[PDB]
Symmetry: C3
Subunit: 343 residues, 3 copies
């Protein structure tokens, strides 16, 4: 697999793919901190390759004869199906456990033992669970690599990877760490519960980025995350009093941002009905709301959406969430290729 | 790589067609209603299915559609159609991703059909979709950037069922295709003619040929008017309509007379088929049933050589392999 | 065409033609462990060992390509279900999965026209036997209501033979001693493994609470099989209350699960749940060569510390299910 695509050859951070693969072989990806600077760039270049290969109907079968287990103990479309598609288009095979309760899969069996056994039959495991902590038990027990597909309200590392790829596409300076080229993002909605928000904000804070956090009170971004953002921006001297701002309305939170990152208000997590109805309707993105964005503003959403983005916005050239979803195929193909390829 | 129909020369001279070019033109078609299939597409479907049936039976290589990936979305529970389609995919040498219910999916959280299909389309080359909704399938088709085959919906279209039904009938009575005023097929549909979509849709398909229909039911479970009209219409279009064309009965002994085909329906009991009931039918008579059958056909009948309902079910495989090959193969 | 290491050594040692045995296995359904005869067992065991060697050298395992299997599990399973599927994928074949008011007969009659074979788990006694007579294709029983689960007994035996190959020789001088421990009344893998082991020169220690004693029917079949090969003595079967006597001079300790579902209420369960707990302390008495098996899953009956003990092989045992299921699919379905 040779990187010939028009991003890698123009890029100014050339890379040794062989060296990075060695380093990447058999790595678990649990949190976005498990992927460093060079790994990221390798993912991104390799992701463009696979995009190019697929867009040009060329042979995508660069990882043959692996068998993966896909374990989804909570509902998923994009994430589960796109992993599987990536697995199959690469020439490898997948076993699926898709069981809708953590309870009735650990049926008096410890997680430790389940992952001990299960890892013997496969080269790798993809693992979504509504528990934050189970993936950690799994990583220590497993003899094979785990890719976390979302652990409760913790993280979604491969979401953040495909999100970044999509951002980089429109705003390639995000990688340069150039103090005169700041990206501005607005994260809107369920900041407390959104594992995608969590992973993407920690990832972006390693680059030259300022953050608008647009939420109603009970879904404010967790303090531990702003401390992580704050620490990371300080590390590269991109921190100022303007780096992080909090808003409770759209009009203000959307000003001068390159990226609008919309999110779903997670009904499943609310107890007060009235509080849900109120929060549900707070931030609704519409062409009217977009009139005052920058012209180059791009709209992401990890999906699925309920009412938070009106369908009219799909026709606005600012909306890219369907492309974003598409990219998951390419990014997940790249991640798997890098980790699981033979020596 | 490229599927060759045996005896292409004879089939092109008999029907007055070019089967190679019909087949080429089916690339990327979606098949949602039986009316999506014209006269020439049906021949191609039928002969491409025979070919796969020849192949599999002489243990030959059937891998004519390698390296495709399909998503199979089944939001009803099913057994035979779901399995049948996955077997067809796998025997063609392609791969399949399965959804077998709403709850394991982002539908659970309220995602729309439009969104879910816009996205699924980008991961795969095509989609097989079953959904007890009336209109989700049509939404899926405008949302989808890839061809879809409808595996069964709430408007009662189930077109691969009516294609395999047709293929079974044609097997034993090939003259069905010929539209020859001297060779009329007669068929008795029997049972829940009111609810059986499978009857409605095969009715609609058969009525494009020289056929006549005996409908056998209670007054309660009569055949719908809309469907008679379409039968009547379609028969008049090739001059096969006469006052004989559509008889109506309320017992087997009368209904089963002089039919080539008996098509039993699931009731969803004056109509229970037995060896005795069958003594007075024609000798060439074949009995179909889309399946499953509770007790509308007694197990004794399975032994009778007039029974072909298990062969009918087996034919779903060849028909679905044919349809996947025709819609999705490269050039 | 799979080649077996030492094929000809083995033929002259057991007075068999392996090739002819392997060939004759084409289209055999495997429902009950009594459907596997002496020669079929040898064939499965050495065929499993070849797939073990082949997978451990990252060699080509694709000895059964272009078959399509249906997998029908009408009760929850993960270890058994996945293992079969992995076995299939790694042989280069494909599977359709059912994980979940038509007759069984009709369902299997149709289903077997689409597929080359079928793997079926059903807690009904009846359905699997119905399926076998209705199906046009071979079936592998993955577990049914009659306590039959033959690939579990095959993998259990394969595991024991790995450490004590003499188990196959029927050498009056080389006897294997096994302790089965825990719920002997309900532990259906014990019943089945007991019957199979009793065809060879083996001694049995049954270690249980009174009410969970081995059933007299199993003792009987054991006694019968042992007497048939002239391996039976009043010492062939011993009964124990406790583990320290229990575990003396056994090559194998086979721990069973204590199944909460099989007791009236949680109070009765609790009577038995902790009665036998294997620790490193309880393992001090055992022979140096003692290996510990457990069909899994476990709860408290083997303390986690025992996993690090080199005597524990229950995880290698679970892993062996892959090599055995591969072997069995190979022998039944290949040309």
């Amino acid at each position: 697999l040779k990187l010939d695509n028009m991003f890698y050859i123009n890029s100014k951070y050339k890379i040794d793919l062989d060296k990075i693969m060695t380093k990447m072989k058999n790595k678990s990806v649990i949190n976005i901190d498990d992927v460093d600077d060079e790994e990221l760039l390798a993912i991104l270049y390799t992701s463009k390759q696979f995009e190019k290969i697929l867009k040009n109907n060329e042979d995508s079968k660069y990882l043959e004869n692996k068998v993966f287990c896909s374990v989804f103990l909570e509902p998923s479309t994009r994430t589960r199906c796109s992993f599987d598609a990536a697995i199959l288009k690469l020439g490898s095979k997948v076993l699926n456990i898709t069981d809708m309760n953590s309870t009735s899969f650990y049926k008096g069996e410890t997680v430790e033992d389940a992952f001990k056994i299960l890892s013997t039959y496969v080269d790798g495991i993809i693992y979504r669970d509504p528990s934050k902590k189970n993936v950690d038990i799994a990583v220590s027990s497993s003899s094979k690599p785990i890719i976390n597909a979302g652990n409760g309200t913790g993280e979604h590392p491969t979401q953040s990877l495909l999100d970044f790829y999509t951002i980089h596409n429109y705003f390639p300076f995000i990688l340069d760490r150039n103090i005169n080229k700041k990206l501005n993002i607005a994260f809107v909605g369920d900041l407390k519960n959104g594992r995608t928000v969590h992973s993407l904000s920690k990832l972006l804070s390693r680059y030259n980025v300022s953050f608008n956090f647009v939420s109603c009170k009970s879904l404010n971004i967790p303090k531990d995350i702003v401390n992580t953002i704050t620490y990371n921006l300080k590390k590269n001297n991109f921190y100022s009093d303007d780096s992080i701002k909090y808003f409770d309305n759209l009009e203000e939170g959307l000003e001068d941002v390159h990226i609008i990152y919309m999110t779903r208000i997670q009904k499943e997590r609310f107890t007060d009905v009235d509080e849900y109805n109120q929060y549900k309707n707070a931030f609704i993105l519409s062409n009217k709301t977009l009139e005052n964005t920058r012209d180059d503003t791009k709209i992401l959403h990890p999906l699925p959406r309920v009412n938070e983005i009106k369908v009219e916005v799909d026709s606005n050239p600012k909306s890219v969430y369907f492309t974003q979803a598409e990219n998951g195929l390419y990014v997940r193909m790249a991640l798997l290729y890098l980790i699981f390829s033979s020596t």
